[PDB]
Amino acid sequence: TKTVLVGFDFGTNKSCVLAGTAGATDIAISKIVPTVVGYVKEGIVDGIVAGNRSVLFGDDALQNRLHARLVAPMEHGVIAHPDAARDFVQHLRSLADPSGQAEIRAVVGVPANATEQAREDVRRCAFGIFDRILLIPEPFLAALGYRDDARLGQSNYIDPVVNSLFIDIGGGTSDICLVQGYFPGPDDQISIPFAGDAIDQLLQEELNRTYPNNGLSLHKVREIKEAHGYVGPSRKPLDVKVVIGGKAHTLELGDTLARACNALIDKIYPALTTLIQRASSDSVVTLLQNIIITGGGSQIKGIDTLLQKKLTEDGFESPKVRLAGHDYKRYVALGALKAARAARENQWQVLLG
Amino acid sequence: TKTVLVGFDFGTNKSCVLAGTAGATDIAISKIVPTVVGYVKEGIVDGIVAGNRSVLFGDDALQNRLHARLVAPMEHGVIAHPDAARDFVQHLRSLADPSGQAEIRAVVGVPANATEQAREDVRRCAFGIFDRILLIPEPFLAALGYRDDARLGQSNYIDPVVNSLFIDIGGGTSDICLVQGYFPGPDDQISIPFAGDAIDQLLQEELNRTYPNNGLSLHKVREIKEAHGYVGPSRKPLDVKVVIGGKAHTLELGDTLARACNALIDKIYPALTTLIQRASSDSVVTLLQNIIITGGGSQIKGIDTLLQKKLTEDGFESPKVRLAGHDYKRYVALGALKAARAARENQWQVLLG
Amino acid sequence: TKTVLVGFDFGTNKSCVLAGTAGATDIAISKIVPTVVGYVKEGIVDGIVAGNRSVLFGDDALQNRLHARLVAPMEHGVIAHPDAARDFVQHLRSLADPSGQAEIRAVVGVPANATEQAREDVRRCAFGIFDRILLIPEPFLAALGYRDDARLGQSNYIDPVVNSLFIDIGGGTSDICLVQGYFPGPDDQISIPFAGDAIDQLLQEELNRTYPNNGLSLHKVREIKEAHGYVGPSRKPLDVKVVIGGKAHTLELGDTLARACNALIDKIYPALTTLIQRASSDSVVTLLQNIIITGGGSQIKGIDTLLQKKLTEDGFESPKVRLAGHDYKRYVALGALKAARAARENQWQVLLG
Amino acid sequence: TKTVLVGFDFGTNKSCVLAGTAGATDIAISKIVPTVVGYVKEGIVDGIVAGNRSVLFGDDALQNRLHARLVAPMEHGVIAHPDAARDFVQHLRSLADPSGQAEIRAVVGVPANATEQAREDVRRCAFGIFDRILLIPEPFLAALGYRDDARLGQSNYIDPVVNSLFIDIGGGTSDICLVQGYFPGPDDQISIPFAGDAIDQLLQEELNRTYPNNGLSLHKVREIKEAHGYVGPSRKPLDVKVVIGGKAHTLELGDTLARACNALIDKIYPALTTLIQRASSDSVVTLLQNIIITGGGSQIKGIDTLLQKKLTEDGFESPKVRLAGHDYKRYVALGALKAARAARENQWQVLLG
Ligand SMILES: Nc1ncnc2c1ncn2[C@@H]1O[C@H](COP(=O)(O)OP(=O)(O)OP(=O)(O)O)[C@@H](O)[C@H]1O
Ligand SMILES: Nc1ncnc2c1ncn2[C@@H]1O[C@H](COP(=O)(O)OP(=O)(O)OP(=O)(O)O)[C@@H](O)[C@H]1O
Ligand SMILES: Nc1ncnc2c1ncn2[C@@H]1O[C@H](COP(=O)(O)OP(=O)(O)OP(=O)(O)O)[C@@H](O)[C@H]1O
Ligand SMILES: Nc1ncnc2c1ncn2[C@@H]1O[C@H](COP(=O)(O)OP(=O)(O)OP(=O)(O)O)[C@@H](O)[C@H]1O
Ligand SMILES: [Ca+2]
Ligand SMILES: [Ca+2]
Ligand SMILES: [Ca+2]
Ligand SMILES: [Ca+2]
């Protein structure tokens, strides 16, 4: 049979699976599936769900979220629902391996400091799916996939892995990591369970507190944040057109979005400065010049400017906070695929049980 | 009152206690008790442990390791847990003295270059237990106990004490010693804290790295090494039948045991050659012909052949590495008993305070 | 006053009270009273209930269930109706102490992982009834009462407490517990609120869904399950003679009972294997040989064979699932009485308030 | 500007701040604030807390512990909550400096062998508060503050610093120190994280084990120990009047307080005798005559007599265990102020960040 190395980014909001053979460098499969499993509701009529499938994954479960009970397999970057997570990894295996006969060797991205229970949860929802697994911190894989191997060696290209600080603000955890060329130790990374889902929850609370029984689902309170959420000083007026009870209302969520998204900064800044002061004095001056924000939370309006302003005001020697880029979804999966093709035979973990 | 001279081999894995009267040469008591103390767990049901004992020693603590919290009194050939060590020495005193009224004079075996703190640790967990103590290095006691006094003087018997090199590869330390007829000086012996427990730890790491959350206890990772561990070139395939999570699996640990046990050789060979080149040039040609491996580590499959091969390949004049024999457990205790019966009245150390 | 140690198995379906003096080993009082309180209905004619009692307990409330409103004090192994539970414990106190003057010291059996609120519920409906209380998990007490103290020490008697796995499938909870010689920790036991009452509810739903308005009470849907309920493959045809609307009908409930009782296996097997894989690898090979099912749910037709089959096909090393025996009702009460006579003076909890 | 030298005793139960100018010997500010920070709860009605303060410190937080969430900044003599500790040191700075404009130079008392992390926790919660810091072990500062400089030189006054052994039994740690005239080395002191809060925890466990759901807060289980706690043989009957569930009960806590308080002796005695045997033989005969107990734990009923009895029974040459005195709270702050006024310009540590 053939072996398929799979860079797997098991996220709280969206997972991304990449599949390629050994020796080569191209990417056979590259899918970005929202981490959600929809169990088609009991009593569903035939023809409502295309193919009468009883379990939907990703967008197929988000479009049919009216007919399906949605369950997010992952919460705070760790597996919260083992059965849904197993179903979802089983779906993504068929995605990364359409034939279903190849031996999958997956490097799955775990949070920065994932507890051994949170790692056995991933090694248990991957048994019988992935033949060999390898659990690497998510921000290190983000640094490894953001790195342009085609542009290495050049002088006009600064390596994001040689000396940088990666602030992978996902949708479950916000992992900061001191990526200093090698596999980061337990002290080179800090994971805060406050990210996109926490800002969604804060907006849900500040909406059910001022506009009670609004009925706005978390999937819409998330779109409000993705479209209008911002960090920094309040922006008023900021009219958000919502649908509350069938009727179209226009809420004023300037202060609401400001307080919801600035809590993320207030959470990740004490851990940003902690790792900045944990770095070696010889290398921190360039570490400040190479601070990179990845993950979905990098798309928050004005987060790099606010973080660089807060690091400059605190006296850090000329920080330069940078955004990862447009491909913030595949960075952890690209890094996990690069770490799969570079993993030694003795590095892969055997999944028995 | 009567005096009982006790040859005590306080080991990291097994301690062997011998007891005999003065003047005679027979051996009254001879016990080999695994150095372990199991404190019966809180809430134990009556009748689970025979006699409702709350502290179990040796095999009684290994058979009842499910109901008892086991603590190893000794780590790296030095007392690591003083309370468990004192409990264990108190048990072995009752073993060497069932009446409990005789004055015990014990020669305890310490590592090759045991620090004065590591020796006061043994003289402190023996106060009130042994009336007089005498601390002699463990490999010299192994040389003394391996020596056959019934076969001395004969021409067809080579004395292991007259001029030999003893590599007592224990379970905590691997002490190499130039046994040249007399009490070895501090430069005639080298102690490396790498032995059976270090190979057990290396196997535990190599198993939790490839077969994560295997749950194999150290007492089973140790039996794997005793049954299949080997030094030399890798032997594949070498199937080890284990029980991981209730289910019976068959792991492939050829390279694993190879890398685990060859680290012991890589550790003890720089100290083997150091003392071979420290010996007098007049006597080193005979030293190489009398290289003897004792301790549990002598039972590793193919360790004398590997060490003789490494010593011949390095150009040493015809080395002949030999195993101690089947009685590798009592050799330090036999030597300590022979050193107790030959100790002058001024050699015994008084334990006060 | 005299002290009476009372082993109390407060069950969801039946509670077993045992009473004995201190120091002795005989059992003075031993009653099995169905956990139910029948409050005699308003307007009851004199002479309908023997003695004109207004509150009936156990069988006296089951025979007079036409004249009394029955309330089950316990649901899911925890006290659900505090007033009925206090009345019922007050009745069982008079059962264990007919004189009503002795100081009762009761060891009540709680579920495996009973929350502190579920324990204060039992310590609150026992205040003024039991002078000292002691709450121990129900499966551990089943292990302690199944143990035959007359045959301890013998070689031909395997101890159910030294190392075993007890599946106390009651009528409210199904508690699995790693009984390994000592008081089980919070991780050695899992309690699932799915047992006899859950299968009763599943049968009630599957009967009100196919045979609507059948009028079969839960007390008859329960007898259907006790008489014909089975786990494993469906058995058709399986005719159950019932009385629906006064008329005698003969339903076909092969698939119905199959699906109702196999849900219990589907619920308790993920928690069975969880503790099988939680046990130490040194003792799991014996744990699988000593898997014991107690409680009412042990009487389900073919549950030990089915669970042994499911554990064998999953690769567990030669499991051997055994049934507790005929005396499955007194095992928790016998164990609580053995734990009362062996409880230290500082183990008894004082009930004030 | 003016400089204010501040002897700061940052305790687990009570922190004492002393402030004085340079050159003089009088004490400008002397406050004893219980180390607690009460964050006023959300939704507090105006007028409940005097001044509508949102953060209360010391007694102001203990009197309003019903309206405020109390957090102890310090646990085991080290800073456990950095934010509450920073607020608390900020309050104590305003206490030692009402004007808030003077340059504060604080000598803060750390435990005996405070780890460098536990010292950077104090230098980090003091940055921007104290301009210069100096961390000295707490028992040495207690020895320095117990010293009567007004009585030095006299013949009828034995100096507590020239040669003594201080058992500062605080509320977080119980530090024993060989105070032999100079700054004690790392081997002249032992810190045990078992003191007042550990006895409070032991009493809480022994009360929730015998009188379950008693609801007695730690602040009341602490007053029980302060009013009735004793070391030595059990004192029965010892009736303690408590309030359990609104109702006034009278518990018997003779054995309870005995076992709770004698654990402190059993913990601090192996470290007491360790330093007694670490002292020079020339000075140990005087050291035993000058054994002094300070800190809150010195107020335990019969602790000096019990420790002197235990030291005499062990054969130590005529020990004389003495209590510090009534002013056991300001001794560490008095010594820290005496060491601030005697600290050289190069001894002060600059706090930058
Ligand atoms: N433009 C935006 N503004 C604000 N938030 C956004 C934006 N785009 C995405 N997000 C948030 O980012 C989250 C997704 O994060 P991302 O996809 O970067 O990493 P992730 O895979 O979710 O991280 P993890 O692996 O920790 O789950 C979503 O929950 C979403 O709420
Ligand atoms: N056949 C074998 N193969 C490999 N290792 C073995 C074998 N037999 C014993 N050992 C190892 O030897 C170790 C101890 O045996 P031995 O009695 O020779 O040393 P020891 O006296 O316990 O050690 P020390 O003197 O350092 O305390 C054990 O930990 C065990 O792992
Ligand atoms: N032969 C049988 N077949 C199927 N179910 C049975 C049988 N006998 C009893 N049961 C069920 O077992 C339940 C009683 O369980 P048991 O008496 O073993 O413990 P319990 O007191 O219910 O414990 P708990 O209160 O923790 O549930 C009853 O509800 C009944 O439905
Ligand atoms: N009379 C008493 N009996 C018993 N314990 C007491 C008594 N008085 C005070 N305590 C205990 O002493 C503790 C306070 O110790 P003290 O004030 O002597 O030093 P501390 O500053 O708290 O110690 P640290 O500096 O280690 O925090 C309190 O927790 C209290 O429980
Ligand atoms: Ca991510
Ligand atoms: Ca040895
Ligand atoms: Ca039961
Ligand atoms: Ca103090």
Residue numbers in the entry:
A (entry chain F), B (entry chain C), C (entry chain B), D (entry chain J): 34 to 386
Article sentences:
We next used cryo-EM to determine the structure of the BeeR filament, to 3.1 Å resolution. This revealed that it adopts a three-stranded, parallel, right-handed, staggered filament architecture. The diameter of this filament, at ~80 Å, is significantly larger than most other actin-like proteins, and it includes a ~25 Å-wide cavity at its core, responsible for its rail track-like appearance by negative-stain EM. BeeR possesses the canonical actin domains Ia, Ib, IIa, and IIb, with the nucleotide buried between domains Ib and IIb. The longitudinal interface along strands is largely similar to other actin-like filaments, with domains Ib and IIb making extensive contacts with domains IIa of the subunit above. The cross-strand contacts in the BeeR filament are distinct to that of other actin-like filaments. Each protomer interacts with two consecutive subunits of the adjacent strand, as shown on Fig. 2C. Contacts with the top subunit are minimal, with an interface area of ~35 Å2, and consist of a hydrogen bond network between Arg 157 of one subunit and Thr 307 and Gln 310 in the adjacent subunit. In contrast, the contact with the bottom subunit is extensive, forming a contact surface area of ~ 450 Å2, and consists of multiple hydrogen bonds, between Glu 149/Glu 153 and Asn 246 and between Arg 242/Arg 252 and Asn 380. The N-terminal domain, which we identified as a hallmark of the BeeR family is not resolved in our map, supporting its intrinsically disordered nature.
Here, we report a family of bacterial actins of unknown function, conserved among the Verrucomicrobiota phylum, which assembles into a unique tubular structure in the presence of ATP. We identified a family of actin homologs, most closely related to MamK (25 to 30% sequence identity) but present in non-magnetotacic bacteria, and therefore presumably with a distinct function. Sequence analysis confirms that it possesses the conserved residues for ATP binding and hydrolysis, and structure prediction confirmed that it likely adopts an actin-like fold. 2d classification suggested that it adopts a rail tracks-like architecture, consisting of two strands rotating on their individual axis (Inset). This prompted us to name this family the Bacterial elongated entwined Rail-like protein (BeeR).
